[PDB]
Each structure stands twice: as structure tokens, then as C-alpha cells.
């Protein structure tokens, strides 16, 4: 009657947690008061059958009972006679997720730091551009009122022209600043991609190890590691 995909008194929550990452059939069962696919209560006394019922809908559509009811997925994973050894092997398998997680989550932070850093630079430029534009307006502003008083070529004009020049040589300095930022933001954007790159590479390795490990752990009969 065990039926290999029968979990006895496994909790409500854990079914969802063993049905975690499933594309499937699994069984649970207040005793005074149940197949999960969509939770359906069963009744031995739901809608001419218990064990045979599972085989009855194993290869048959449940459309008969309800319209919405048009993979056993309880393998014990025999795929190693030493409890400690298989345990050591699964713990050594585990010894990787505990490592794999760390690399995954290390990047997740850098992912975020880099991403925040990026917007900071991103907005910084805007800052420059509008600064930049004002200094332009200023140098343009003087020519209207600069040449307009130019009547002499006595002394004054010569001095003012030198003072006015700083402006064109300051604007030079600033453009160089934004520029210098822009080349870092590129260096950042490219950095950023690589993190996502390596996250999607650990991302699913991290999944398979966690599964067989849980499978090896589930496999034995009595959290050391």
C-alpha cells in the first residue's frame, strides 16, 4: 500500500515545498475532517474504488468528476550501503550549495551596489550637462554686453578679455570631468552585465545540487551539516 509516492502524514506546507519547482501528482491526508495536483479532499466511507484510485487516475482524465480535471514524481532516488558514507557524499554535495549560495549571494550584493552606483553616475552626468549649459549661457551673456561697450580698439577692455577667457578654459575643464565620468559608467555598465551573466550561470547549478542533496537527505532513515 506504501505505493512509493505516498508520504503518509507529511504536513500541508511541505507538500507545496516538495511540489516546489514541479511542471505532477502527490498525496497527503484533521482525521475527524487528500490529493494535491489544486487540492482535492478524498473520502473513504470525494464525489466504487483507495490505492486502486491513484492507479485509476494514474493514466485516466479526471474530467468525469469535474471539467477542471482533464508524473508520479515521488522517486526515492536509489541512484552506497554506508549510512555515514552516502551521508558523507550528500554532505560533501551539500558542502557545495553552502559554497555555491555564498558566490550567488556575494554577486547579488555587488549586483545591487553596482546598480545603485550606476544610477548615481547616471544622474551625476545630468548634473554636469545642466551646469555645462549655464557656463555656455554665461560666456554668450558677456559678448552682448562686452563687445557692445567695446568702443576703444582704452586699458579696461584688455584686462576684461583675460578675465573672460578663464570661462572658456573652465568649460574645457568641466566637459573633461563629465567625459571622465562617462568612461567610468561604461566601465560600470559592462561590469554590471558580467554579474548578471555569472548569476544566471550559478543560478541553476545552485538548483540541481540543492535537489539531489535534499533527495540524498530524504533517502535515509534514522541537521549535523
Amino acid at each position: 500500500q506504501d505505493a512509493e509516492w505516498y508520504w503518509g502524514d507529511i504536513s500541508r506546507e511541505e507538500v507545496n515545498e516538495k511540489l516546489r519547482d514541479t511542471a505532477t501528482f502527490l498525496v497527503r491526508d484533521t482525521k475527524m475532517h487528500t490529493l494535491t495536483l489544486k487540492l482535492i479532499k478524498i473520502f473513504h466511507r470525494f464525489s466504487t474504488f483507495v490505492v486502486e484510485l491513484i492507479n485509476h487516475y494514474r493514466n485516466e482524465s479526471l474530467a468525469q468528476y469535474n471539467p477542471k480535471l482533464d508524473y508520479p514524481v515521488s522517486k526515492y532516488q536509489q541512484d552506497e550501503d554506508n549510512i555515514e558514507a552516502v551521508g558523507k557524499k550528500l554532505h560533501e554535495y551539500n558542502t557545495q550549495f553552502q559554497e555555491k549560495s555564498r558566490e550567488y549571494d556575494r554577486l547579488y550584493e555587488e549586483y545591487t551596489r553596482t546598480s545603485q552606483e550606476i544610477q548615481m553616475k547616471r544622474t551625476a552626468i545630468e548634473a554636469f550637462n545642466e551646469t555645462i549649459k549655464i557656463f555656455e549661457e554665461q560666456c554668450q551673456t558677456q559678448e552682448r554686453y562686452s563687445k557692445e561697450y567695446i568702443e576703444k580698439f582704452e586699458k579696461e577692455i584688455q584686462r576684461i578679455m583675460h578675465n573672460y577667457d578663464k570661462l572658456k578654459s573652465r568649460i574645457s575643464e568641466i566637459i573633461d570631468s563629465r567625459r571622465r565620468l562617462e568612461e567610468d559608467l561604461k566601465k560600470q555598465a559592462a561590469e554590471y552585465r558580467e554579474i548578471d551573466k555569472r548569476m544566471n550561470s550559478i543560478k541553476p547549478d545552485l538548483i540541481q545540487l540543492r535537489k539531489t542533496r535534499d533527495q540524498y537527505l530524504m533517502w535515509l532513515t534514522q541537521n549535523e551539516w
Partner: protein
């Protein structure tokens, strides 16, 4: 030798937030800096000015240096023009306040430009306050060209207008009421344990007055019945004051009335008043004073003077102010969605073989089979132009229907790479058609799922992200959801239609079975109990019966098939006139599970009709977060929340801080800013109060930043040298001396006391601040206000637990069980930055042990705690102190176990001088450790205290008493468990790694063992407690 002599060659020796700095790059601008101030003339006079200098002083001296320069005649009289420059947010900001210091401008670069004032509405122009307070320029919003945004701002002011009128309708009583809401409890009837503390409804209260030398104060100690209102209390004080040998009783009685109405009661030493006739006991101060065995100190306050403090709000409106071609049920086709082309997706070519987009239709939880477009164009330049076909007739789409999708890469390599969600109807009840550009979000740390339908609906506003391009079928006309009138017809027709069948099928005979009251049994069930399809049909079939059980309404929506438009139409109608339900019941309806507007709307009306301002403050954190799941910007919950915010300053205060804290969160950045814009525009003179708090927090945020990252690897001595030096500087004196503590704006903060200010030992360099209380009765309450400003940790997890703790105390108190727990004050004011209230005369168990430590080299004598505790409390006190200690200890044991918070050790457990025990630094809160367990384990040390320094303390009357409290208290919480699940469930939005899903919340269920009998649960609760403790927990039950 050790490591099998095997080398590791890899090995060698080798949070974020937008700068709060005065300049870009630099945290602390130098005392003297070079300011290039630009003039209208085209002269760049460069200037050196003090870092803390007024714009006045810079303009005043710029003009002095100006004469000495070319074209002096063109520059006009000072007063004519003003200063403007680019700021750290990339925005040009005109500078109207000339009192503002240079470092307080957050300039991008250290330059200024002079221009004449443009926009005659300088005062209108001066709503930068709003943006300052809000955290982003109001200018940015006007640029936003989305019609929903624009409509939000224009339309939402209805509320603002309405709100303003109520405040000033009954001016000034009414204004003061708004400014200083009465702080009162939920119901007047006092608990019997509270009742016993006073003698046959009698309270001794001290009233203070200042009279004619207006420098001297006079107690009028007196004994009143607790139910007495302040009016009567004011009278009693006037009677006592004016009684005299020359005054006859008639004469005395007449004076009492003339002087009676002229005064109001204010709490001494903090700005809390009593302006509403409630029983004195009902005000919080009063009931605290009772419990703490303290004598109330109210103060007679001249109405005239109090009204003088209030200022005119003077709310002003802002500058900003078809033919329904085909109905949905007309449209006859299956839902179609055309996927075009991803762009920026970045995956290592080698590692992942293929990449595909997966989509599903959703209503919170699915209304048809998810489908995935064929895996294709893996390596790069994905361009699968497939049309996806979803089996659901277009008319059957429910109003709150949303498309959910992600991109995945891959034998089980399944893993999401990006995700996004789209509401299938625009805010105007219109079904969407055409090309759509959707920028996906990155997956959260937690989920292996491929879909993330809880993900906030809408396009990630980060441009430089994977963008997915889409086509929505066009049906020759804009298609709108049907009008309510139209749906009702369909509801009634489908009703009339039911009668005619003969046979019975799985889901619906007329006769209503007494045995099948299973509904009631199911009803009581907690929300996380999965419900079966068989139960679903069962309920659905007896929908009509349930209208008698209003509380079953939420089980009865999860039952509904949202894909069927008939069922939903009928459901809209039940919900229309369904009976009002308890607000805590109603709150479940505003979580991620119930998105339908009709359902939601109903829920708000429960709150509108039945939610007391007291209880709303208690649940205000949850209600702001539920905003994320509301489908559009303009919703009834926001309007409910905004009216309550503008109608009660205390509610508004915390409304603002909770929105502001989340603005860093880019999912809600937009909805919360616009909501802050609304509130700030209309709140009143508070905005100036909030701006002072915001100025202060920014100052502290920048200061701490410098210790945490530039002054690290310095001696505490050097750090405190710096700290003190920096605080004495004038912009700090201005910025922190005079303002309302955000933890509780009743407490006024003035004249920082630097004597008592210091950096704590922690590596995050939390600042410990102490300010003068400027209430004239500083003495009768507290003379010094102390609070801890912490930049580095993420408080909201703590924040939530303290709310949950507070909430357990109330249930227990109101079930007669007197377990006293100190849920100390905590407010998250930004990204991992916060305040924590300071509790005086409270030490960690460890500190106790170190104080009472003998010569050395031994285990500290378990008795030290007891011995320390005995020495503080001597005499008849000692019996009571153990009680308090014992009560608190039992209380925390239950909550801690129920919530499964961080392992407690000597370092995270506090005991007050009086004897009360409290917990701090909860940290992670539902067994996130695993990646059922007793966090709080009473060691020997506690037990000795519990058993008054007995030997072999486990078998004592004292301990027996103790075990009683746990069972009753644990059992008490279990009976209210529904509330806790929703509270948790409502917080799923808030980006908290503990709360990523319903699974997470599910631990509480295990903890309260909602799956067993109450009697079973007590044995199970005893089991774990006996199991963890190693013994003493066994064989007891009810009478």
C-alpha cells in the same frame, strides 16, 4: 603537518545610498571653499566663502567685490535679483531663502549664478519645501507625461479640499483638535486588573497652574472618579483654587462657571492635550500612570494661549487645474498576445543552451493554463514573433486581470532571468491594445519560480534594462469594461436562468441542510489553510447562505472561479450590499490575494464605517504597504488614507514618514512621491515641522556616513573628537537644536546637550543623542529626551516585530491577562537608517554579570541577576518586582516562541531596575536559519528570580504560577491568530527578505499549531517547551 602540507594558491590578504554630502563627491565641504559666483554682466568673479555662510552674506560681499570689477554700472541694487545653481539632484534651483547656508544647498558644484526673480508667485515658486521634504523635486513630476500620473495630481485634490474645510469648519477648536488629536484608547470600559489598582473608581491627579507672577507654579492635588471628563476635572481644580472664607458657596459656584470653559487640560512636559470629553482613564497618559503606579500631572492651559500657538493653514490650490466604441462582452475571440523581441538579455553563451519567454494570465492566482512561447534564438538577439493563445474568452477576463511573464534559460535548468507584469485594463476601465514596451525587473534573491505574479505590476523605470516589446490584439475600437448597471442585468438573468435545470452536477438541492453548517467550521479557519476545490464548489453553491455569516466573505472569494464572467457578475452583486464586517476581517481584503476593486471598495467601507483613529494608527504600517498591490494610482484606499492623514496630524505624521521611508524603493517611488506631494501641499503648517525633521535626519545621515566609511580604522577617542567638533559647528546647532522627534512628535527636542551625546560601541556607529525638553513642566515628565540614530541596519523587520509585540500585549490585557512587554519605539526613516527610543535604567543580562563579577576565572554566579535585582528592590518592593519580572519573562517567552525570532543570549535581553525584562535586536524573525524551535530558553538565572532565589527552582509554586501564564497567553494569541496572519500577509510587498511569500508566513501556523485541537496545542506547546528546557513542563490542563 596539520593540513597535509597542501597550499591554497588562490588566497591573498586583499550600505549604498545617494550622497547626503554638501558637494558631489565630498561628504563634508571645507570650512573655506572657492565659490565661482556668475553675474548678469558675464564676469565670473571667483569667491572664497565660509562653508557655513548665509546667501545674504555672500550676496552682500559679492556686491562689495562686484564694484571693483568691469561693467559695475550694469549690475542693479542688491534687492532687485537673486541666486540660482544646479543641485546634487540634477535640477536648477532658484534660492529664495537667503538665510540658507552654503553647505545646506547640496550643490552639485560650488558655483552660483545671479538672475532677477521670475514668476511673480515667489511664494508659489517656494514649494521646493514640498520637494525638499518629499525627497525629489516637484518639478520632476510636471515633466512626467503619463496621463494617469497627471490625472492623479489634478483629481486627488478633491480629498485635500474636503479635508481642509473640516479642520477650519469649527475653527479654532477644530484646528487644535486636528493639530493635537486626543490620544485615547479603543473603549472606555477598563480591564478589571487595571480597575483593582485604583480604589472603587477613584484616581488621585495633580493639576498645576502658574497664575500672576507667571513664573511660579502651584499643584492642586485632588481625588476624582476615573470616568470624570476633563471639563469636570477643570472645574474641580477651579473649585479647589478659588475656595475662600470670603467666598460663599453660591459666590464660589458662579465663579467656577465663568472661569471653567476658559482652560484646557495638557499633559505636563510633552505636547499631549485632552480636548475631547472621554473618561480620563481612556487617555493613554492616564492609563500608563495607573499601571506604572504614577500620579497624573495635567496642567490647566488657557484656551487663549493654546489657540495663539495654532497658525492659519491658508491652503491654496496648485498651478495645475469617445462614444465608448465597443463593450467587452461584445468582443468574440480568445485572448491573443504577440511577443516580439527582447533586447538587453545577457547570459554566458557556453553555460545556457536556450532561452524562452514564459507568460500567464493572473488574478493574484491563475484563471487559465500558463503557456510558454517556443524556446528559440538562444545565444543572442532573441526575436521570436510568436502570438501566444490563452484559452479564455475575452469577455470572461475579470476587471483586475493582469498578464504575468518572465524570460528563462535552460534535464532541469529551469530558472527565471527577468520578469514583469501588465494590468490588462488601463486606469480608465479600458482593455489594452497595440504595441507595448516593457522593461523587466531583475529576479529577487529568493525565488526559483519562473513567473513572480506578486511582482509589482508596471514597467521597471530603469531604462538600461532588458526591454520586452509586445502587441495587444486590436478589435476595431477601444474596448471598455461594462458599466455596473450592465453587469447587474447579467447577474439577475443568470439567477433567473438557474431555476430550470433538473439533474445535479459537481458544482451548483434548494433545501438548506442543518448538518452542512460546515461553513461556520470553515469560516473560523485561518486564511493560510488551503481550501479544496470540493470545498470551493461546496461554498460557491451555498453563496446565498453565507450572507448570514458576514465573516466567511474572504473564504468565499477564493472559492469563486474568476475566469467565469457569470459567477463574478453574481459575486459583484453579493458584495455590493453584503453586511459590514470587523475591520481586522476587512483588512484581509486589501492584501495581494484580493485585487478586485469591488471587493476592495467594500473593504474600505468596513474601515470607513468601523475604524477608530486609535486602531488605524496601530495598523497604519500595513495599510501603507498594501498600497503596492492596489492596481492604479487613484484608488479608494489611498483617498481613505489621505483624508485620515489630513484630518489627524498624529496619523498624518506617521503617514508621511512611512511613505518617505520607502521612496528609495523604485517600485513604489512614483506612487509614494505623488501621495507625499498631495499630503505636503495640504497638511498645513506641519510641512515646516516636517522640513525641520527632514533637515535634521539628513544632517545626521551625512555625519554618520563620514564615521562609517572615512573615519573607520580610527580610535573612538578620535571619532568622538570629530563628532563633538562637527556638532558645535553653526549649521549643526541650527539643524538639530529645535525640532520634534519623529519617534513621537509630542516630545519636543531643543538645545542638544553635547555633554551626553556619543557614538556607541557598535561597528555601524549609531549616534546616541540627548536633547533638552523645553516644556515648562520638563521636571514632572522627563528633563532629557534620548534617542539612537542608526545608519546601517535595516530596522523595519524590528519595526514590525515591535508592532506584533505591542499587539499581543493589547489582546492579553483585554483578555484580563497582565503580561507586561516593552515594545520600545522604532521608526525606519529611509534605506537601512532609523531611530530607536532609549529606555533608561535598563541593562543587558551580560552587563549585570560584568558589574556583579567577583575576583574572576569562574562562571558568574547565576544568583548575580537575582542578587543585582534584590539590591535594586528591597522591602515589600521585592515581591512586586519579581511579579513584574515574572509576568514580562513569561510574556516574552510566548511571543518569541510564536514569532520564532533570533536566538536570545545575555547580549539581547534587557532587565530594568524595577524588574521588567525586555528583548532587543530581534533581527531575522521566522526561522530563516534553516537555509519549530524555542528562541527564548529560560536558563537557570531566570528561574532563580522566578522562584525567589530557591534551590532546585523547577518545582516551586512560583514556577507553577509561571507555567499558567504561558498556557493562557499562548492560548490567548492562538484564538486571535487570524489577525497576525493578515498583518504578516499585508507586508509581503515591503522588500523584506523574511517576507518573500505566503510560504514564509507559514511558520507561524506550525508555531500556533492551528492544525490541532486547542487542548492538543497546549500539549504540543508544552512538548516543545519541555523538549527545549529539558524538563518541568508536563501534566496540567483546565479546571
Amino acid at each position: 603537518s596539520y593540513y597535509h602540507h597542501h597550499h591554497h594558491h588562490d588566497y591573498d590578504i586583499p550600505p549604498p545610498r545617494p550622497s547626503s554630502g554638501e558637494l558631489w563627491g565630498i561628504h563634508l565641504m571645507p570650512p573655506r571653499i572657492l565659490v565661482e559666483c556668475l553675474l548678469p554682466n558675464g564676469m565670473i568673479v571667483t569667491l572664497e566663502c565660509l562653508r557655513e555662510a548665509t546667501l545674504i552674506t555672500i550676496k552682500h560681499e559679492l556686491f562689495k567685490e562686484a564694484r571693483k570689477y568691469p561693467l559695475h554700472q550694469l549690475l542693479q541694487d542688491e534687492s532687485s535679483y537673486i541666486f540660482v545653481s544646479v543641485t546634487q539632484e540634477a535640477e536648477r534651483e532658484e534660492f529664495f531663502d537667503e538665510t540658507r547656508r552654503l553647505c545646506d544647498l547640496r550643490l552639485f558644484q560650488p558655483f552660483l549664478k545671479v538672475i532677477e526673480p521670475v514668476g511673480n508667485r515667489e511664494e508659489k515658486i517656494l514649494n521646493r519645501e514640498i520637494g525638499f521634504a518629499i525627497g525629489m523635486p516637484v518639478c520632476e513630476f510636471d515633466m512626467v507625461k503619463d496621463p494617469e500620473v497627471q490625472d492623479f495630481r489634478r483629481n486627488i485634490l478633491n480629498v485635500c479640499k474636503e479635508a481642509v474645510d473640516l479642520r477650519d469648519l469649527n475653527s479654532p477648536h477644530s484646528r487644535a483638535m486636528y493639530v493635537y488629536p486626543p490620544n485615547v484608547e479603543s473603549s472606555p470600559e477598563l480591564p478589571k486588573h487595571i480597575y483593582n489598582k485604583l480604589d472603587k473608581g477613584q484616581i488621585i491627579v495633580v493639576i498645576w497652574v502658574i497664575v500672576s507672577p507667571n513664573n511660579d507654579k502651584q499643584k492642586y492635588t485632588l481625588k476624582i472618579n476615573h470616568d470624570c471628563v476633563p471639563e469636570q476635572v477643570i472645574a474641580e481644580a477651579i473649585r479647589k483654587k478659588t475656595r475662600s472664607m470670603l467666598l460663599s458657596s453660591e459666590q464660589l459656584k458662579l465663579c467656577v462657571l465663568e472661569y471653567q470653559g476658559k482652560y484646557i487640560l495638557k499633559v505636563c512636559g510633552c505636547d499631549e492635550y485632552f480636548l475631547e470629553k472621554y473618561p480620563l482613564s481612556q487617555y493613554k497618559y492616564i492609563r500608563s500612570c495607573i499601571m506604572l503606579g504614577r500620579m497624573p500631572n495635567l496642567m490647566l492651559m488657557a484656551k487663549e494661549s493654546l489657540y495663539s500657538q495654532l497658525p492659519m493653514d491658508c491652503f491654496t490650490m496648485p498651478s495645475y487645474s469617445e462614444t465608448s466604441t465597443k463593450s467587452l462582452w461584445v468582443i468574440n475571440s480568445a485572448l491573443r498576445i504577440k511577443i516580439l523581441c527582447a533586447t538587453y538579455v545577457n547570459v554566458n553563451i557556453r553555460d545556457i543552451d536556450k532561452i524562452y519567454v514564459r507568460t500567464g494570465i493572473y488574478h493574484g492566482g491563475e484563471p487559465l493554463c500558463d503557456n510558454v512561447n517556443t524556446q528559440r534564438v538562444p545565444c543572442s538577439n532573441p526575436r521570436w514573433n510568436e502570438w501566444l493563445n490563452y484559452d479564455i474568452y475575452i469577455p470572461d477576463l475579470p476587471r483586475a486581470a493582469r498578464l504575468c511573464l518572465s524570460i528563462c534559460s535552460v534535464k532541469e535548468e529551469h530558472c527565471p532571468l527577468a520578469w514583469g507584469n501588465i494590468n490588462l485594463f488601463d486606469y480608465t476601465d479600458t482593455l489594452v491594445s497595440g504595441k507595448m514596451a516593457l522593461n523587466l525587473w531583475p529576479v529577487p534573491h529568493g525565488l526559483e519560480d519562473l513567473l513572480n505574479p506578486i511582482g509589482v505590476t508596471g514597467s521597471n523605470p530603469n531604462k538600461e534594462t532588458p526591454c520586452l516589446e509586445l502587441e495587444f490584439d486590436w478589435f476595431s475600437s477601444v474596448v471598455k469594461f461594462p458599466d455596473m448597471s450592465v453587469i447587474e442585468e447579467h447577474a439577475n438573468w443568470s439567477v433567473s436562468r438557474e431555476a430550470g435545470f433538473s439533474y445535479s452536477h459537481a458544482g451548483l438541492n434548494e433545501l438548506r441542510e442543518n448538518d452542512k453548517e460546515q461553513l461556520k467550521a470553515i469560516s473560523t479557519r485561518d486564511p493560510l489553510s488551503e481550501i479544496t476545490e470540493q470545498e470551493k464548489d461546496f461554498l460557491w453553491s451555498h453563496r446565498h447562505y453565507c450572507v448570514t455569516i458576514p465573516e466567511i466573505l474572504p473564504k468565499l472569494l477564493l472559492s469563486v472561479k474568476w475566469n467565469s464572467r457569470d459567477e463574478v457578475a453574481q459575486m459583484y452583486c453579493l458584495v455590493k450590499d453584503w453586511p459590514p464586517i470587523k475591520p481586522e476581517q476587512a483588512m484581509e481584503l486589501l492584501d495581494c490575494n484580493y485585487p478586485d476593486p469591488m471587493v476592495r471598495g467594500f473593504a474600505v467601507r468596513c474601515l470607513e464605517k468601523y475604524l477608530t483613529d486609535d486602531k488605524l494608527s496601530q495598523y497604519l504600517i500595513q495599510l501603507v504597504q498594501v498600497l503596492k498591490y492596489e492596481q492604479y494610482l487613484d484608488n479608494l484606499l489611498v483617498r481613505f488614507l489621505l483624508k485620515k492623514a489630513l484630518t489627524n496630524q498624529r496619523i498624518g505624521h506617521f503617514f508621511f514618514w512611512h511613505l518617505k521611508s520607502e521612496m528609495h524603493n523604485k517600485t513604489v517611488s512614483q506612487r509614494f512621491g505623488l501621495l507625499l506631494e498631495s499630503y505636503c501641499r495640504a497638511c498645513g503648517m506641519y510641512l515646516k515641522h516636517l522640513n525641520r525633521q527632514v533637515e535634521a535626519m539628513e544632517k545626521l545621515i551625512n555625519l554618520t556616513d563620514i564615521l562609517k566609511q572615512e573615519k573607520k580604522d580610527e580610535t573612538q577617542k578620535v571619532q568622538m573628537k570629530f563628532l563633538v567638533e562637527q556638532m558645535r559647528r553653526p549649521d549643526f546647532m541650527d539643524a538639530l537644536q529645535g525640532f520634534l522627534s519623529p519617534l513621537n512628535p509630542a516630545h519636543q527636542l531643543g538645545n542638544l546637550r553635547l555633554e551626553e551625546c556619543r557614538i556607541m560601541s557598535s561597528a555601524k556607529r549609531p549616534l546616541w543623542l540627548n536633547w533638552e525638553n523645553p516644556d515648562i513642566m520638563s521636571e514632572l515628565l522627563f528633563q532629557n529626551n534620548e534617542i539612537i540614530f542608526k545608519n546601517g541596519d535595516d530596522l523595519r523587520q524590528d519595526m514590525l516585530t515591535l508592532q506584533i509585540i505591542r499587539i499581543m500585549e493589547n489582546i492579553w490585557q483585554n483578555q484580563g491577562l497582565d503580561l507586561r512587554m516593552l515594545p520600545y519605539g522604532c521608526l525606519s526613516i529611509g534605506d537601512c537608517v532609523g531611530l530607536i527610543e532609549v529606555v533608561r535604567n535598563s541593562h543587558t543580562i551580560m552587563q549585570i554579570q560584568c558589574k556583579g563579577g567577583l575576583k574572576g576565572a569562574l562562571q558568574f554566579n547565576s544568583h548575580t541577576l537575582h542578587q543585582w535585582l534584590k539590591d535594586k528592590n528591597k522591602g515589600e518592593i521585592y515581591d512586586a518586582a519579581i511579579d513584574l519580572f515574572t509576568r514580562s519573562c513569561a510574556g516574552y517567552c510566548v511571543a518569541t516562541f510564536i514569532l520564532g525570532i533570533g536566538d536570545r543570549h545575555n547580549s539581547n535581553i534587557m532587565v530594568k531596575d524595577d524588574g521588567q525584562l525586555f528583548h532587543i535586536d530581534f533581527g531575522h524573525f521566522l526561522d530563516h536559519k534553516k537555509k519549530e524551535r524555542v528562541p527564548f530558553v529560560l536558563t537557570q538565572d531566570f528561574l532563580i528570580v522566578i522562584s525567589k532565589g530557591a534551590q532546585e527552582c523547577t518545582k516551586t509554586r512560583e514556577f507553577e504560577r509561571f507555567q499558567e501564564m504561558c498556557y493562557k497567553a499562548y492560548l490567548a494569541i492562538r484564538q486571535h491568530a487570524n489577525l497576525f496572519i493578515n498583518l504578516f500577509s499585508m507586508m509581503l510587498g515591503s522588500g523584506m527578505p523574511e517576507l518573500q511569500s505566503f510560504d514564509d508566513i507559514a511558520y507561524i501556523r506550525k508555531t500556533l499549531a492551528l492544525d490541532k485541537t486547542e487542548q492538543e496545542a497546549l500539549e504540543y506547546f508544552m512538548k516543545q517547551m519541555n523538549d527545549a528546557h529539558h524538563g518541568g513542563w508536563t501534566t496540567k490542563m483546565d479546571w
